[PDB]
Amino acid sequence: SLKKGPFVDDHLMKKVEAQQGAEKKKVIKTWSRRSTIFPSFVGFTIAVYDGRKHVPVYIQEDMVGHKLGEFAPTRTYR
Amino acid sequence: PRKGPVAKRDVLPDPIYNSKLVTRLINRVMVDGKRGIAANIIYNSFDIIKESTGNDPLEVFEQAMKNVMPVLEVKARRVGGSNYQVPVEVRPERRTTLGLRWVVNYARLRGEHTMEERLAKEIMDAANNTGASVKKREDTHKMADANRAFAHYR
Amino acid sequence: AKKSMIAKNKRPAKHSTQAYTRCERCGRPHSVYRKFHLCRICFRELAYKGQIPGVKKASW
Amino acid sequence: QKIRIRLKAYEHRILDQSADKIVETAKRTGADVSGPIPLPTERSLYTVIRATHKYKDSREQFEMRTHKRLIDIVNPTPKTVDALMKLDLPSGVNIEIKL
Amino acid sequence: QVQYSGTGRRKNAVARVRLVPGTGKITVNKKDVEEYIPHADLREVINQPFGVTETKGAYDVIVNVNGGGYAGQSGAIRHGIARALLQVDPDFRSALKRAGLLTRDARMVERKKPGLKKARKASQFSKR
Amino acid sequence: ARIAGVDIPRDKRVVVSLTYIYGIGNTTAKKVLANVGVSEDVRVRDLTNEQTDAIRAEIDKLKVEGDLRREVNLNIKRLMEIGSYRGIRHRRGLPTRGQNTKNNARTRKGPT
RNA sequence: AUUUAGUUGGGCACUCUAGCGAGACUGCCGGUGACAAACCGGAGGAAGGUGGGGAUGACGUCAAAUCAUCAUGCCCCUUAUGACCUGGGCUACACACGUGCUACAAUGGGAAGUACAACGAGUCGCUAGACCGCGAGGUCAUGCAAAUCUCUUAAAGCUUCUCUCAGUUCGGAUUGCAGGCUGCAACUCGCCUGCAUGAAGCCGGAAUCGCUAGUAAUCGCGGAUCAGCACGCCGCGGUGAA
Ligand SMILES: [Zn+2]
Incomplete structure (x- = not known):
């Protein structure tokens, strides 16, 4: 319930932008907690940070609604 | 309890029948302090009494007391590490309390759909040697005197 | 590990949900009456000396 | 008429002694003062557990008690206003005047 | 005309009985007898002082009750009426003291204790 | 029918x-x-x-x-098959706001 | 008299508010008792046998608990076991134990209409009224630093219909979808609403717990800490037992 639209920080935007007409980069080091996904963020490759490790994951177009917090499982049950 | 005997709390009579016995009858139905619902369903039970074989609204309750009320009960009065329970005459107020218990507190088990057919017709049945609470007293007297010889000397 | 933290809590906060409550003369994080800015037990100690106006014992 | 005051303190003895003093000075140059109307005297409680580390099964509490009185004045003189501004003490009660 | 006074209290509920020579009814908070007093059978409950003094009427009763629960504020009606019947004639005070209905029930809700569940109920405490 | x-x-x-x-x-x-x-x-x-x-x-x-x-199956099939962290614990029946269970498995599986 | 209405004219009559006071002490009589302490009844009264509760905890016991409220004898660390910031975690789960909440339905569920409390809180805090919404609620706004304005018209209550004994119109967990609110931000990890879903569970062995009357049992309400979050804690009141 975030009735006034999505929420993505502006200190997430500042790594690269010129990968819009070219083949994208591989390094996206971040914190990857607060920001959700809205369709301008499709098909990148982000090192999602889980408190210890910026774990790399790339994007499908239907991995689209939830935040960057599904893909930082901080439990380590193995 | 330990020191001496305790007081016994005589009660108030009814607002209609002016009876302490029917008042005590209401008070051994009452759950969670809902007195008016139990009192009103007992007046409804008297209305079911008055219609189907209406004889007397209170004599049917006194005959329900007739066919239930005990006279005997065993009590474990051992002396020197034994098991010689003695069939002992019961106090008269405890006698009536056991009668009310055997009438109402057994009437949970009729299981009929109408919610006071387990009450009104149940105390109709106890007036004339029917209802299983009579045979409760019968088997109670039969398990009494099972040590009639080796316990009545104490 | 608190002499830096008491000076940390005298500063204006980074944002709104950081200025919590602790005691003044001690530094307890839990069970501080915000009407008095005292903890549970320094209040108890000063309550007997007649040094807090208002407060008496309570029997009823 | 154009004056009514309030009394709020902690001890009713200081309350009604200062109230009797100001009733004594009330109809000095004026007239028709209304008496000490009582008020329902708000009260608080608290709860402090009698330990430092454990033992919540034994506790302790205190109380705040705020006694309140009330004195009304009907049809006053102008001379009592400068008289009551010369009346300032005791300090245990705090007055609350209007016009 | 003249009116007869009386007051009765029970269970944190207060009543102001106003007895008048009437026909035998009660008006409470400017309503009828059993509009504001609900389905409960508490008529001869209230008319029990009438069964020992001036049976059964015929005096209408004004009262303005407030506070407490319904049965407690009903029981307080009994005592303003009996106080009024003492106000009318001295010759019934023996008949009231044999019947009671004059002593105020001083018994009300008990103070708790900080440390239990209730005023006397203790919590479960497993021995092993 | x-x-x-x-x-x-x-x-x-x-x-x-x-x-x-x-x-x-x-x-x-x-x-x-x-x-x-x-x-x-x-x-x-x-x-x-x-x-x-x-x-x-x-x-x-x-x-x-x-x-x-x-329709419910394709909903939860969309759910469990993206990554999915919610699928791992969806099959272990704990809600997406969390419920922090060490004895609330007796709702579904009855581990006793 | 008036007005929807104790409102406005008026009174302090009743109630209430709370200061100063009176009142219950074996006080009188009768029996029991060595005639003594005392025990049992009676009259009077609001309560008669320390009227009902609370605060109040001796000598001492257990090297019981506490350096993690505080102070501190001694010992150790000091470009660090000290300090700043981001993100995570104390909220995991093959398991066993303790404490509470909700049910296993007919003294009941569902729908309709219909009454009576007490304590306390309120300035960046409680919201009157109005409009709209299935709702959590949204907007304009009026009173309120207080016996006045709000929280707030309490639930069990009462009258009619209903269902007809079933894993059920009982039950209400689990799960998709849609939302609402404070927070810079509800994934890890807040609460609440609506739709769709509907599990166990028909009174629980051995054993074990609390309680002698406004108590036990049931039902609501308020407060602390608090942007937000309570089945916990503290307090009050209704019905009222064996
Ligand atoms: Zn302190």
Whole structure:
């Protein structure tokens, strides 16, 4: 319930932008907690940070609604 | 309890029948302090009494007391590490309390759909040697005197 | 590990949900009456000396 | 008429002694003062557990008690206003005047 | 005309009985007898002082009750009426003291204790 | 068999018997009975062929299906098969806001 | 008299508010008792046998608990076991134990209409009224630093219909979808609403717990800490037992 639209920080935007007409980069080091996904963020490759490790994951177009917090499982049950 | 005997709390009579016995009858139905619902369903039970074989609204309750009320009960009065329970005459107020218990507190088990057919017709049945609470007293007297010889000397 | 933290809590906060409550003369994080800015037990100690106006014992 | 005051303190003895003093000075140059109307005297409680580390099964509490009185004045003189501004003490009660 | 006074209290509920020579009814908070007093059978409950003094009427009763629960504020009606019947004639005070209905029930809700569940109920405490 | 989907039984009235299918709570039932102009009828279902066909066609205006079960399956199939962290614990039946369970498995599996 | 209405004219009559006061002490009589302490009844009264509760905890016991409220004898660390910031975690789960909440339905569920409390809180805090919404609620706004304005018209209550003994119109967990609110931000990890879903569970062995009357049992309400979050804690009141 975030009735006034999505929420993505502006200190997430500042790594690269010129990968819009070219083949994208591989390094996206971040914190990857607060920001959700809205369709301008499709098909990148982000090192999602889980408190210890910026774990790399790339994007499908239907991995689209939830935040960057599904893909930082901080439990380590193995 | 330990020191001496305790007081016994005589009660108030009814607002209609002016009876302490029917008042005590209401008070051994009452759950969670809902007195008016139990009192009103007992007046409804008297209305079911008055219609189907209406004889007397209170004599049917006194005959329900007739066919239930005990006279005997065993009590474990051992002396020197034994098991010689003695069939002992019961106090008269405890006698009536056991009668009310055997009438109402057994009437949970009729299981009929109408919610006071387990009450009104149940105390109709106890007036004339029917209802299983009579045979409760019968088997109670039969398990009494099972040590009639080796316990009545104490 | 608190002499830096008491000076940390005298500063204006980074944002709104950081200025919590602790005691003044001690530094307890839990069970501080915000009407008095005292903890549970320094209040108890000063309550007997007649040094807090208002407060008496309570029997009823 | 154009004056009514309030009394709020902690001890009713200081309350009604200062109230009797100001009733004594009330109809000095004026007239028709209304008496000490009582008020329902708000009260608080608290709860402090009698330990430092454990033992919540034994506790302790205190109380705040705020006694309140009330004195009304009907049809006053102008001379009592400068008289009551010369009346300032005791300090245990705090007055609350209007016009 | 003249009116007869009386007051009765029970269970944190207060009543102001106003007895008048009437026909035998009660008006409470400017309503009828059993509009504001609900389905409960508490008529001869209230008319029990009438069964020992001036049976059964015929005096209408004004009262303005407030506070407490319904049965407690009903029981307080009994005592303003009996106080009024003492106000009318001295010759019934023996008949009231044999019947009671004059002593105020001083018994009300008990103070708790900080440390239990209730005023006397203790919590479960497993021995092993 | 019976009139829509399967098994609309008699001996109960209309708002009761229609609850028996996968897709009717109680608000759907009252709104569908309001869309025709019908009543409880009565405590046994004794409707007429006009009424049964009307309430048959109005249910077809909804998602009331046996593929509504398949609709739930494709919902949770979308859920569990992206990554998915919610699939790992979805099969272990703990909600997406968390419930922090070390003895609440007896709801689903009964580990005793 | 008036007005919807104790409102406005008026009174302090009743109630209430709370200061100063009176009142219950074996006080009188009768029996029991060595005639003594004392025990049992009676009259009077609001309560008669320390009227009902609370605060109040001796000598001492257990090297019981506390350096993690505080102070501190001694010992150790000091470009660091000290300090700043981001993100995570104390909220995991193959398991066993303790404490509470909700049910296993007919003294009941569901729908309709219909009454009576007490304590306390309120300035960046409680919201009157109005409009709209299935709702959590949204907007304009009026009173309120207080016996006045709000929280707030309490639930069990009462009258009609209903269902007809079923794993059920009992039950209400689990799960998709849609939302609402404070927070810079509800994934890890807040609460609440609506739709769709509907599991166990028909009174629980051995054993074990609390309680002698406004108590036990049931039902609501307020407060602390608090942007937000309570089945916990503290307090009050209704019905009222064996
Ligand atoms: Zn302190």
